[PDB]
Amino acid sequence: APDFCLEPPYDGPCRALHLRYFYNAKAGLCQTFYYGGCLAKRNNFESAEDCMRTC
Amino acid sequence: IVGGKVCPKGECPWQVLLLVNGAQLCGGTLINTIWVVSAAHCFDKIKNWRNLIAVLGEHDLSEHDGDEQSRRVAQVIIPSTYVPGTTNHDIALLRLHQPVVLTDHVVPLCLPERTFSERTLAFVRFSLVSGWGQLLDRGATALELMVLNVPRLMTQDCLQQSRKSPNITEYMFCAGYSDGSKDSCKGDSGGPHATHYRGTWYLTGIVSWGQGCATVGHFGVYTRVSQYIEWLQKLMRSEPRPGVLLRAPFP
Amino acid sequence: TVAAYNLTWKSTNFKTILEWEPKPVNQVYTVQISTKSGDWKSKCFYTTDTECDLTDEIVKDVKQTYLARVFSYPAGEPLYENSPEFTPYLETNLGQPTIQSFEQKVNVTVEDERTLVRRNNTFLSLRDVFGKDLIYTLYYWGKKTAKTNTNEFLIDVYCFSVQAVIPSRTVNRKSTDSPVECM
Amino acid sequence: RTKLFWISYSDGDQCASSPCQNGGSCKDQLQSYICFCLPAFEGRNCETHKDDQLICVNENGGCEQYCSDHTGTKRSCRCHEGYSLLADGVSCTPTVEYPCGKIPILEK
Ligand SMILES: *[C@@H]1O[C@H](CO)[C@@H](O)[C@H](O)[C@H]1O
Numbered sequence: 001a002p003d004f005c006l007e008p009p010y011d012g013p014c015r016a017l018h019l020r021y022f023y024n025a026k027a028g029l030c031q032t033f034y035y036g037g038c039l040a041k042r043n044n045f046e047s048a049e050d051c052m053r054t055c
Numbered sequence: 056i057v058g059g060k061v062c063p064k065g066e067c068p069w070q071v072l073l074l075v076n077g078a079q080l081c082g083g084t085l086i087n088t089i090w091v092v093s094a095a096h097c098f099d100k101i102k103n104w105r106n107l108i109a110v111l112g113e114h115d116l117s118e119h120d121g122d123e124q125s126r127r128v129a130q131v132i133i134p135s136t137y138v139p140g141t142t143n144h145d146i147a148l149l150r151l152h153q154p155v156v157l158t159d160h161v162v163p164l165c166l167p168e169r170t171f172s173e174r175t176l177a178f179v180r181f182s183l184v185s186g187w188g189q190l191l192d193r194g195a196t197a198l199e200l201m202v203l204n205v206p207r208l209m210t211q212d213c214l215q216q217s218r219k220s221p222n223i224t225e226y227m228f229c230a231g232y233s234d235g236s237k238d239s240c241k242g243d244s245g246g247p248h249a250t251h252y253r254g255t256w257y258l259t260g261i262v263s264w265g266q267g268c269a270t271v272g273h274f275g276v277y278t279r280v281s282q283y284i285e286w287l288q289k290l291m292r293s294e295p296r297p298g299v300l301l302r303a304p305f306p
Numbered sequence: 307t308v309a310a311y312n313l314t315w316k317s318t319n320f321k322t323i324l325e326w327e328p329k330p331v332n333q334v335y336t337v338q339i340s341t342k343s344g345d346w347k348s349k350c351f352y353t354t355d356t357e358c359d360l361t362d363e364i365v366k367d368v369k370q371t372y373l374a375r376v377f378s379y380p381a382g383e384p385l386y387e388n389s390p391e392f393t394p395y396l397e398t399n400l401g402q403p404t405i406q407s408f409e410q411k412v413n414v415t416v417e418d419e420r421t422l423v424r425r426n427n428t429f430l431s432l433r434d435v436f437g438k439d440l441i442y443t444l445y446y447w448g449k450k451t452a453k454t455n456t457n458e459f460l461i462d463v464y465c466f467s468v469q470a471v472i473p474s475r476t477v478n479r480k481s482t483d484s485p486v487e488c489m
Numbered sequence: 490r491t492k493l494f495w496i497s498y499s500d501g502d503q504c505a506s507s508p509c510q511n512g513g514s515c516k517d518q519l520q521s522y523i524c525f526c527l528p529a530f531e532g533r534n535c536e537t538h539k540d541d542q543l544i545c546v547n548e549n550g551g552c553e554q555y556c557s558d559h560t561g562t563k564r565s566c567r568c569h570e571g572y573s574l575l576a577d578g579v580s581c582t583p584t585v586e587y588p589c590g591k592i593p594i595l596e597k
């Protein structure tokens with residue numbers, strides 16, 4: 001996996017509840033958070049599968 | 056909502072609940088029988104639009120009292136000007152597949168005329184922001200609709216009062232508290248900012264963003280709806296067109 | 307449009323005018339005033355003046371703290387500047403007093419002058435408004451003095467002078483000296 | 490102090506010029522005056538007719554809902570859809586059971 005993968009989840013300033021996936025390095029596994037909906041960082045996916053694919 | 060109260064059942068009857076497959080997404084504002092106004096970023100990477108439902112007359116999420124009306128959003132309209140995953144021009148106009156029935160528990164908020172909005176409403180100090188959003192920044196979302204009253208700021212004062220975040224444009228306005236005590240939060244996007252005037256309530260803002268929720272030295276940022284009344288009215292009179300997701304020219 | 311500067315409150319016995327600069331060139335002004343939590347109220351609509359009378363607004367509640375702002379316009383939010391905060395009760399200046407009469411010890415009487423504050427369409431006096439916050443100082447002629455929480459001095463026998471004072475004040479504590487009187 | 494006294498001592502009556510307009514009463518001050526105005530006037534000099542600013546930016550022109558300014562003429566008042574303007578020409582009254590921005594509960 002790429003570097004971004006070490007980056008903490010980024011919910012951003014938007015106040016929507018987008019359930020997204022991120023990779024927990026600590027855990028060395030993908031997990032979920034609520035993205036606000038704008039200014040998403042690279043460690044943030046639509047699903048486990050492509051997150052897992054990616055990190 | 057951070058530091059509000061439960062909005063007494065039926066006292067925020069224009070308040071809408073947007074869900075995607077039964078899960079809470081954002082709020083909305085009924086401005087008539089088949090149109091709801093929300094936030095442009097609520098629609099980020101939504102893939103199954105057949106599951107996107109608007110609920111009217113809703114109050115307590117833990118139970119179904121029977122006053123709730125649910126409708127599939129037939130169409131999501133945003134300005135051609137909104138760039139995906141950003142804050143500028145945060146607004147959407149949702150067309151309900153079938154109209155809701157007006158009841159004691161389901162009433163639209165008045166969309167005002169732009170000069171009314173700008174000459175008078177923007178100078179009314181407090182307005183109510185509501186939702187089923189987070190009770191605290193990293194807290195849990197409410198089961199019962201919350202309502203909060205916040206004071207508005209002209210952008211220069213907001214800037215000055217802010218600890219030195221995206222840019223606050225002409226399409227936005229700040230409202231709230233800089234003491235980390237009251238604001239809107241995650242789960243309230245799309246929700247109304249409603250101003251009381253001479254006995255009538257009017258839509259003035261849309262829940263949008265903030266640098267956290269009720270963060271010291273920060274205010275909640277709302278979409279400045281007055282900027283869009285005309286775009287919104289042309290669309291409600293426009294003959295209905297096909298796409299599910301439409302990015303209409305703005306102005 | 308240029309932005310108004312040097313916003314200053316001019317207030318005497320509650321008569322209150324906000325003054326600014328600069329003199330306008332192809333630009334107009336409008337004033338907005340409010341209390342911490344109330345609505346903004348527009349005054350002196352698109353004025354070429356560099357002053358705005360706000361008495362009518364501030365007498366509504368002399369105890370409240372006001373803020374007004376001056377908006378500038380060519381002759382999207384306006385270009386504006388905020389004024390110092392103003393609490394009428396605490397800062398209005400005390401107007402020049404007046405000896406009403408005096409009589410022979412001597413008994414001196416100071417007039418209870420009216421202010422810009424109205425209660426059911428009638429002007430209130432200094433006493434109506436400050437109650438016991440108001441005290442007076444007599445000066446007689448080497449010179450002497452006397453203070454009361456009333457409008458009378460009972461001295462020992464002449465020229466006298468009076469000055470109104472709100473000792474409880476931090477700003478604008480004393481009025482000017484009234485025109486002197488002599489027997 | 491004595492300087493304040495002396496300044497005071499040697500000042501004249503700024504009211505000599507009869508500045509208070511329209512029924513107003515001038516009261517002399519130290520190198521200034523105050524104008525006590527009649528209820529329908531305001532201003533430093535009582536020059537302002539509280540009566541002459543029926544425009545839309547002035548308390549919504551006294552309209553309940555919408556206000557339209559008009560050159561060479563009086564301002565117009567109007568209402569939202571589901572509402573009708575009254576004979577008074579400033580007020581709006583609902584034309585539907587469920588007019589926008591009315592809370593049935595609070596109303597009933
Ligand atoms: C009468 O006198 C005062 C004293 O300065 C002056 O300021 C006014 O303009 C005038 O009418």
Ligand SMILES: *[C@@H]1O[C@@H](C)[C@@H](O)[C@@H](O)[C@@H]1O
Binds near residue numbers: 512513514525527
């Ligand atoms: C002074 O004050 C104003 C209010 C009017 O009453 C005048 O007639 C009076 O002399």
Ligand SMILES: [Ca+2]
Binds near residue numbers: 117
């Ligand atoms: Ca329910």
Ligand SMILES: [Ca+2]
Binds near residue numbers: 503517
């Ligand atoms: Ca004088």
